[PDB]
Amino acid sequence: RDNIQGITKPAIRRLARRGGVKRISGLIYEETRGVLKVFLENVIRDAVTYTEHAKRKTVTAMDVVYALKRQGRTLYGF
Amino acid sequence: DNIQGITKPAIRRLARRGGVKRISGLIYEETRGVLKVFLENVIRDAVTYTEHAKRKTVTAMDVVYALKRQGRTLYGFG
Amino acid sequence: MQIFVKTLTGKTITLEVESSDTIDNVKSKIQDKEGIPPDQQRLIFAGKQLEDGRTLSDYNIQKESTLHLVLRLRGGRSSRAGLQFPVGRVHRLLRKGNYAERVGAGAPVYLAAVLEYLTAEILELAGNAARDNKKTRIIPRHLQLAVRNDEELNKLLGRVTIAQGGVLPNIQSVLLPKK
Amino acid sequence: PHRYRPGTVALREIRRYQKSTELLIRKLPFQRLVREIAQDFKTDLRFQSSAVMALQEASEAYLVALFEDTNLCAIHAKRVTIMPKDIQLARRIRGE
Amino acid sequence: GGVMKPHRYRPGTVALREIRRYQKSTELLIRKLPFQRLVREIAQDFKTDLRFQSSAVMALQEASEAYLVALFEDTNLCAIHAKRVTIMPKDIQLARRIRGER
Amino acid sequence: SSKLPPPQLFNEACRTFQVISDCLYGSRSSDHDALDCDCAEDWRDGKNHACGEDSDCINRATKIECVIGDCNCGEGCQNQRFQRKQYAKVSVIKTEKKGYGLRADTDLQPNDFIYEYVGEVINEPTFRSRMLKYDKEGIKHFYFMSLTKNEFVDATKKGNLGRFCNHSCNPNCYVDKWVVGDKLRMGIFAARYIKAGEELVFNYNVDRYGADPQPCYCGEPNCVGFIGGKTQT
Amino acid sequence: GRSSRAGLQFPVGRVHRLLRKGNYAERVGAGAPVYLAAVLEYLTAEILELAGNAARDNKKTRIIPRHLQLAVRNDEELNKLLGRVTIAQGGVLPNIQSVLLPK
Amino acid sequence: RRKTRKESYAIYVYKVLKQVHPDTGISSKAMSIMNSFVNDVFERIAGEASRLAHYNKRSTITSREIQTAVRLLLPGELAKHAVSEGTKAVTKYTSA
Amino acid sequence: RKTRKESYAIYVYKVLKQVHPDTGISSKAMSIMNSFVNDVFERIAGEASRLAHYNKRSTITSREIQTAVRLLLPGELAKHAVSEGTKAVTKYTS
DNA sequence: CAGGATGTATATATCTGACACGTGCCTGGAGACTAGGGAGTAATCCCCTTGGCGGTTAAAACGCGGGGGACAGCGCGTACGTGCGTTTAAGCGGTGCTAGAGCTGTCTACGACCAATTGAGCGGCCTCGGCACCGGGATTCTCCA
DNA sequence: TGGAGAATCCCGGTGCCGAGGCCGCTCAATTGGTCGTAGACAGCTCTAGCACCGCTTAAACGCACGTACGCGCTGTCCCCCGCGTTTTAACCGCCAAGGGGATTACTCCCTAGTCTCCAGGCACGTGTCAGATATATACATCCTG
Ligand SMILES: [Zn+2]
Ligand SMILES: [Zn+2]
Ligand SMILES: [Zn+2]
């Protein structure tokens, strides 16, 4: 559905504040939601591919870590 | 000194293949510095492979593998 | 909408189709006119193999577009699988290449099939690029164009450098003169 | 009637969120986003809590790095605000 | 009598002509022998009396030229972004920063 | 404007010659093969020009002209005009001091094709032979322009309507080099607004070998009395 | 124990087992796990020492992810070794660009 | 006396080229590039299948692990047609 | 009644007690350190594996590990790591 | 004023370097058979995922005034593009010399491998203190008179 | 610039659950034999890399010229920020099925290793052709009498 709007404007503003951004154009929010949709689509796709190969029905934390590892954005602590 | 052997017209030609239309006069020193860093890293890794293999000549395969280690794999040498 | 379908033998047939038509439908139309069974048909457009389920609209296929027809070959260990690439050599490389303790029997056949398919796809794009530039010998430049002009292969091969290949002709719009 | 100037609150928030270490996206909306994206690949998928936390961590870190480089592009263009074409430039330089 | 010199090409026209010529061809743009001397000088600081195969120097020249061409492509995109048409050192430093090489 | 306001012929007119419109040069180049671009036309009957005269087509942007028939646009490519003669409208006005002017006949839009200077292209020893025979014969009007640094053009023998011009320290047109059929050629183009009636006179930028030129009759404060070139040859 | 004989805290036996069962080579030299354990001990010791220092510099005696993050990013060579690495719950360095500071 | 038997994918790439376009040749350097490409794709798929076997505590690379590696490596329609070709190959091979 | 899941926890803890006298470490930080050690182990072992393959060798010896360490660690880190490796092998052979 | 020798552009039969195809040979691939262990499948358990509910309250949504920063035009000067003429290393070919890559032979040290053993290290549970949170004052920063 | 005001920081007090340690156990680590192929090492061959040299000429270089583009300033205007008020839904704690991950039991087929055999693939001659080159040849230039 339209649940991608759950990532709201002030949360994106918070991420931007953590990134060092001082002023934010109104179109940045829709652009960031689209970019995040693409990114998460790729990572969840790789995760689901690992999960379906392992003959499991739950995407585990290791599948997500290995998926991130495949894209050179390795994550420590899971 | 031999880093100035990569002459200013050649650097201009390199930019020309990249689509650059006008080049500031200060570009050339930055470009030679970038070239020095890149060649230093690739040649250093190649020399590390030669010292491991107990050979005195940097072979093409050593250069290909050194480049591949830095995520700039090269086709057409083995 | 008029479109053309070109065979590798160079024959073109003309179809009348709509944006709502699926690729399955187009193959059916091609069988009617040309006689080729759909299962043998492989269509390429904009450097993309076309999915039976999708519509021409999904691919932005418009009036007078040309789709390229390639036929998919149905039918020594290599001859048993109908492949050109060496299943045996792949099996040896897998066993003695230190990838796993054991190697399955279907793994070299599957891997050789994937390698031959990718090789055929890139050589086909390179061949088309060379023929469109009026040359008969494939050269590194044509391989470079084949890779960088096909979005999917570009994605797969974004961090590789093809020797003596150059770059794609790409001039920024802003560099051109004004009105 | 005592108001801060348009921008000092931004800097105080920058120091605050760069000082703290916590996920900045709301947990349940992000979990609904994850499950929605996962629906189009396989039906009735289950997720471990640690997998959703790992996804949220990677998502926040990737966006933070993207916004930092977008900010460097903005400052490079003699501005202090970010525009969509700055994000498109940053992602283009990165290689997508 | 006299020689009548007409107007030359406007600045950028010959530049764009070079753009099209070098984007259409594939020959190496760096002089081979000066680059080879550069390679041997850089290699000097690791092992004395190092020898190189010609194919190794050629692979280095290809890799070097491809890396610089791609860097100048990214520099041109960031330059054109900033409403200029002239690349500056800041542009290359920004490109390297965003790429993660700095 | 209308400053150079009975039009004259070409062969109150100037000295006689033969009107040419093709390549009738001495021997010959440019060696730059312009390949068939993928320019979108918006052309079937002439609703819009295919390689447009002021739009973003890659051939016209670099003073390069498509050959007729091999570009993807076919024959509606407006960047074919040296091979199809889409010239402007000038005529030959007699002036008692400026000589012969190309008066504009229709009000001309700025930054467009006006005319082409075509003649005989020759090299340096035959060129100084032409110089010596002409100033021993006693002509007072000299057309010893240079296409490139090596070759030279001359139009008093077999030329066209581009002869009737002069030097003005304030130019209205200008001349720029183009390439057509691997042949380097010359074209005179406008830059400012051009009204029907005034002579289209540009900067010659002559390096005359003689000592006494005719004075610049432009009459402007930008005129130094003489023309002004680059070297004192 | 081979660990005490080599003067290492990391388990050379465990490293050797992972090397044999890890499909890296058909044969694994005896000196290889000792050397690898030594390199792992050095890298671990450096990161832990810097995180500890940062933790004392934040008046904490327990190392938390934020301190590991500060430790990694303030060492240029570790930053180069871990340029594609993301530390969970690590955050970002306090870096505010000069152009945004009030004037 | 001949020097050394060195293997390559030269003749197979040439047979594929003659199967898809009989009147087209290939330069020696281009054949080298194609050989490096085939070896590269091979190394990537074998490495990913190795990691898949390792992560799931298995010591056998079967056609399933190769299939999953293919689905991970090729972006989209390339993966769909690769899985189709591999399925055809394995089916015809084991059923004859 | 639980599967044995190995870790590097106790060894990272030993190293922490040898370098910092009065300092503890959280569970999440220990998890990060454990994944980091497994990551660096995978990198070094993979590099040694491909290095052995390139030179038509079938054995990972001290030489391959040494060259892989010099390849992966930048500068001063590499210098001290090769010092530690040589020291450890010297002590272990004695 | 005059032809002959000479310089120049033109079309040309030919020369070169890279590619297609035939030749011998050898080593690795294919076929056949056996053993053992990884894995496939049935069966059971129980952790932790999913779903729900209810109260809290913090963050998100929303609206509005306003200011300062984005954007566009203008103007200005200087630096970079183009071009010409001068020079110099780049390139090519030709020649010579030897270092070292590449292959082989022989041998041995070194690691695979296997069985027995035992303690290191892991799961479970248990404890107390560092820290998370809160409240109150203190400092610190910001902004408008 | 200084006083007001908001925000944040510091400093003690309480609670709590997770770090850190111990206890029992088991299987993986260690030791000792036993062996078999990888590799270390010496030697030899032959390719190719480096060094030099002459010659030709294409690109680099330095300067001159000029224009157009970068950069600073100024005006405008509009959009996003600060903040207050209202609302909604995240969140936290608790509970209830139950699905499916993980382990067990046991079987069995698939793949490593070995042995036997021969032809497919690789190095190498041999023939053929885009593309560059020295050469007959027509027309204009100088060249001396
Ligand atoms: Zn065009
Ligand atoms: Zn055209
Ligand atoms: Zn004048």
Residue numbers in the entry:
A (entry chain B): 23 to 100
B (entry chain F): 24 to 101
C (entry chain C): -71 to 3, 16 to 119
D (entry chain A): 38 to 133
E (entry chain E): 33 to 134
F (entry chain S): 80 to 84, 88 to 93, 101 to 117, 121 to 325
G (entry chain G): 16 to 118
H (entry chain D): 26 to 121
What do the paper's sentences say?
Set2 is recruited by phosphorylated C-terminal domain of RNA Polymerase 2 during transcription and catalyzes H3K36 methylation over gene bodies. In this study, we present 3.8 Å cryo-EM structure of Set2 bound to the mimic of H2B ubiquitinated nucleosome core particle (NCP).
In the Set2 map, the density for ubiquitin is visible only at low contour level, indicating local flexibility. In all maps, Set2 was in the same conformation, indicating that H3K36M mutation is the primarily stabilizing factor in our construct. Moreover, we show that the AWS domain of Set2 interacts with ubiquitin which promotes H3K36 methylation. Although this interaction is not well defined in the structure, our data suggest that ubiquitin helps positioning Set2 on the nucleosome. Our data show that the Set2 AWS domain interacts with the ubiquitin on H2BK120, suggesting that ubiquitin helps positioning Set2 on the nucleosome. Since ubiquitin is linked to the nucleosome by intrinsically flexible C-terminal tail, it can adopt many positions on the nucleosome.
